[PDB]
């Protein structure tokens, strides 16, 4: 299941289970736009910033 959903605290959960990355469970900055990459790299953009 690739339907990944963000939380208000910013952690990545799939069906309520936090997603596991290379640093353990993945925590993403709150209120950011995410672009998963062909190798799973997660890029975070803060709205308003260039």
């Amino acid at each position: 299941n690739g339907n990944i959903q963000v939380g208000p605290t910013g952690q990545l959960t799939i069906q309520g289970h936090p997603v596991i990355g290379e640093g353990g469970p993945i925590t993403v900055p709150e209120g950011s736009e995410i672009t998963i990459a062909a190798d799973g790299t997660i890029s975070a953009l803060n709205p308003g910033d260039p």
């Binding site: 672009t35 990459a37 062909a38 790299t41 997660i42 890029s43 953009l45």
Partner: protein, 260 residues
């Protein structure tokens, strides 16, 4: 209900606005002191979907990712403030401007409006007014038994009475110049009013630091170039054709989905 239909609808509306501007420009050909208008369009937003520049892979990034655009929308209509060609009407009261100034009139409400048209008349009380009856500042009073009214290049209005070899000065016609001339709000009736984007009205003598020279017996016709309007009409018609075809194509696609 479908995105392409909204985009094509916006395109159709923009082309209709362009045609409206063209028709307004062509309808005011015979208007004196008229400036032709040109509309400028911008695109509307851009759906993000895939953020370009994101990491496509651990060592590589996405070059120019997937952006989906919306339709188009008109930004603004800018006037072309250029000296309309002059015309000799051989009238002592018609005044034309050679430079970049405006005449000031008072509306009945007490506020001040600005007009470039110089077709002036005299009212029953002897004051110089415009064709709409608005009193032109600075309120030059023409006396009862005038023989000839002389308006010079620097804005002096003189009246030559009977049996007097010297002319009697009865006023001083000044011109108002703005920092942003296109920012004035046109209320119709050949009248523009000051807005906050048009700076402040700077009064000046007609011949000084940049006010134009006043010509008596001349009228400034409109600057509308008509061949350009015909070519632009052809362009607008073809663009409206293509946008309507896009609408029809979208209509044909949704039909097959309904049939499914």
């Amino acid at each position: 209900m479908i995105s392409s239909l909204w985009i094509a609808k916006t395109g159709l509306d923009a082309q209709q606005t362009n045609m409206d501007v063209i028709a307004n420009n062509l309808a005011n050909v015979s208007t004196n002191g008229f400036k032709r208008q040109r509309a400028v369009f911008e695109d509307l937003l851009y759906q993000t979907i895939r953020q370009p520049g994101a990491q496509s892979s651990e060592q590589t990034t996405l070059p120019s990712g997937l952006q989906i655009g919306t339709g188009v929308r008109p930004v603004a209509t800018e006037r072309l403030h250029s000296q309309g060609n002059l015309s000799q009407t051989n009238n002592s009261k018609d005044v034309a401007i050679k430079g970049q100034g405006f005449f000031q009139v008072m509306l009945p409400d007490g506020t001040s409006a600005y007009t470039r048209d110089g077709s002036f008349q005299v009212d029953q009380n002897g004051q110089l007014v415009t064709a709409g009856g608005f009193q032109v500042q600075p309120a030059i009073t023409i006396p009862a038994n005038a023989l000839s009214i002389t308006i010079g290049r620097d804005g002096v209005v003189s009246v030559t009475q009977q049996g007097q070899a010297a002319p009697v000065q009865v006023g001083q016609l000044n011109l108002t110049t703005f920092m942003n001339d296109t920012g004035l709000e046109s209320i119709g009736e050949n009248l523009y009013i000051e807005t906050q984007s048009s700076g402040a009205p700077n009064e000046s003598t007609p011949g000084l630091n940049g006010a134009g020279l006043l010509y008596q017996g001349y009228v400034e016709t409109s600057n509308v170039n008509v061949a350009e309007e015909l070519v632009n009409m052809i362009q607008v018609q073809r663009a409206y054709e293509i946008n309507s075809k896009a609408v029809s194509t979208t209509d044909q696609m949704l039909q097959k989905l309904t049939q499914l």
